[PDB]
Structure 1
């Protein structure tokens, strides 16, 4: 074989694709590589899984992997075992291991990453109750993650997104007339659920957005909508989202950008995570330009590319434009 460019930003990856079983197995090995501190192996297994999401048809024979980028001896063997036996011994051993299950449990807590989870694992901790019994080990961020863990493990749905966008738009409009709110993240790519909702806030007049996020947060807090906030241009918070007769905690990310940076922030925050890593790698390695959510920098001329749209950025990098629903790498 199939046409397959090496970088994920060079090919469409739709929301619904084939090979979900094969990719999920490779993504288990990627996650486990991360849990052992091997970011390089994590990346290769993520990239191999993503290649399968971009293929036109189901892989039913090992020969369909010939020539595909990021498939070497290890990733090919995993696919071969799945095709020949329906199961891969290495994947099952990882999946069922105490180490994997505990690291997955701990790293899913808001405020806990691999290094913290591994430290706790090495100390003999295994359950969330173990963590509650030792609150001296916890940051304020981790305390919020643990206190709201049940709700934060409940997938966020589109009905929640629409309600949250309304309350964010109300607070933003009270804080700065003319400011806008754009849904980003996985929901913009067409996903039907997420672990959070991501919003990007700007104003059409450059500079007017300075100081906006503290004003938005104060207004949300005054409506009783904020359970946790980090206290700036990014706010990783937990909202008290009204439900009929009650409420549920929901993770919400709010990001402010000046309008000059909006296309870059929209591109970055729409993802996917792998798509953006691959896009930034492509930009630096293939074009010599440095990309992030603030701009696209030419380090030789020492200038920033002025963009008005995501399309402008793709074109400047020599890439065919992909709409958000084709960025699900």
Structure 2
């Protein structure tokens, strides 16, 4: 029998999850450990959830868990409890916990992460209305946008919306850089029907250093002139060819997506979170691999490179510590081949 690897980068994980009863519970337990800053226990529940997502059959008895890695005693007790009556008492207790409920609610606001959510909870806040109306609190520009466009941003992006955004991004980019290669990355590249945002990788084989640097500024100025730019933060590249977010130039946006552009009213438009990444042409395969995800697939790719191959992988490069050389790649397939891994298709990276 074929042995399931402990690494997500050695598993094929499509969106057809036969174990959602177990993985929904494990994702909740992981999220609680993330909040309680218990990184180790968090990661163990994330890995167990990931491996169950790869299974081609549903777990219906404890015998079905034999030989599956990342399922220790604690995880097997959770699976046993769900087999017993269809529910997880552990995940149910987390769903009813006040700290957990407040963290989920507060971090659902764009611009609010773990530190600000924890701060507001310890101050005694429990609702978004009481936070917004408070006269002592001061909000960042990101949080102001997060509250103003809250319902649109919490409703998530569907495929017709992602496709409409892709058309807008591609059309704007090729207007200013005709030879640019625009790729939608993230969940939508992995075949997802929904996402919290729409991510893109932009690269150009012939653009100069100045042209490459100016593209995101030209495209966002163009949208600003049209009143489509609801939020914009451009992070300049800190990329160093000879060697936390990656160092490529990027922008975190909120775009006004007119309903007439969506082929699938109210105010007639929807606020959409969009991320654009510009990378030098020679790093395009590393950037594409890093931005395609999933987060668990990326973690395990890097963990496999370190522990199994004595290599160092990131969104910009692959370094071989034994040969003392950087390994170049023109495609994701070439990165997988450098690592000694069978190629995993993007729609198989939903770890």
**TM-score (ref. length: structure 2):** 0.90
Q: Work out whether residues 9 and 275 of structure 1, in 8 Å CA contact, stay in contact via their aligned partners in 2.
A: yes
Q: Which runs of 4+ in 1 moved over 6 A?
A: none
Equivalence map 1:1-329=2 (5 Å): 3-134=3-134, 136-205=137-206, 207=209, 208-230=211-233, 232=236, 233-244=249-260, 246-299=268-321, 301-329=323-351
Q: Work out whether residues 176 and 215 of structure 2, in 8 Å CA contact, stay in contact via their aligned partners in 1.
A: yes
Summarize deviations over 1:140-161 as a string: whole Å, max 9, x none: 1111111111000112111111
TM superposition shift of 1:66: 2.3
1-structure distance, mates of 2:308, 2:2: 23
Q: Work out whether residues 21 and 86 of structure 2, in 8 Å CA contact, stay in contact via their aligned partners in 1.
A: no
1-structure distance, mates of 2:252, 2:325: 31
2-structure distance, mates of 1:109, 1:66: 41
| Equivalent residues, number | 329
Q: Work out whether residues 2 and 55 of structure 1, in 8 Å CA contact, stay in contact via their aligned partners in 2.
A: no
Q: Work out whether residues 29 and 45 of structure 1, in 8 Å CA contact, stay in contact via their aligned partners in 2.
A: yes
Deviates more, 1:212-221 or 1:25-34: 212-221
2-structure distance, mates of 1:240, 1:154: 15
TM superposition shift of 1:163: 1.4
TM superposition shift of 1:299: 4.1
Deviates more, 1:229-238 or 1:28-37: 229-238
Q: Work out whether residues 187 and 193 of structure 1, in 8 Å CA contact, stay in contact via their aligned partners in 2.
A: yes
Q: Work out whether residues 267 and 293 of structure 1, in 8 Å CA contact, stay in contact via their aligned partners in 2.
A: yes
Summarize deviations over 1:14-47 as a string: whole Å, max 9, x none: 1112101111100100001101111211111010
Summarize deviations over 1:83-114 as a string: whole Å, max 9, x none: 01211211111112222111101112111111
Q: Work out whether residues 2 and 68 of structure 1, in 8 Å CA contact, stay in contact via their aligned partners in 2.
A: no
> Which segments of 5 or more consecutive residues in structure 2 lack a partner in the other structure?
237-248
1-structure distance, mates of 2:54, 2:85: 24
1-structure distance, mates of 2:223, 2:350: 32
Deviates more, 1:185-194 or 1:66-75: 66-75
Summarize deviations over 1:53-100 as a string: whole Å, max 9, x none: 111211000122123211111111110000012112111111122221
SS at structure 2 position matched to 1:261 = helix
> Which segments of 5 or more consecutive residues in structure 1 lack a partner in the other structure?
none
Q: Work out whether residues 201 and 257 of structure 1, in 8 Å CA contact, stay in contact via their aligned partners in 2.
A: yes
1-structure distance, mates of 2:148, 2:320: 45
Q: Work out whether residues 144 and 228 of structure 1, in 8 Å CA contact, stay in contact via their aligned partners in 2.
A: yes
2-structure distance, mates of 1:49, 1:4: 14
Deviates more, 1:196-205 or 1:301-310: 301-310
Summarize deviations over 1:130-149 as a string: whole Å, max 9, x none: 22123633211111111111
2-structure distance, mates of 1:301, 1:129: 58
2-structure distance, mates of 1:2, 1:40: 28
2-structure distance, mates of 1:277, 1:42: 13
2-structure distance, mates of 1:284, 1:127: 43
1-structure distance, mates of 2:160, 2:8: 31
Q: Work out whether residues 289 and 299 of structure 1, in 8 Å CA contact, stay in contact via their aligned partners in 2.
A: yes
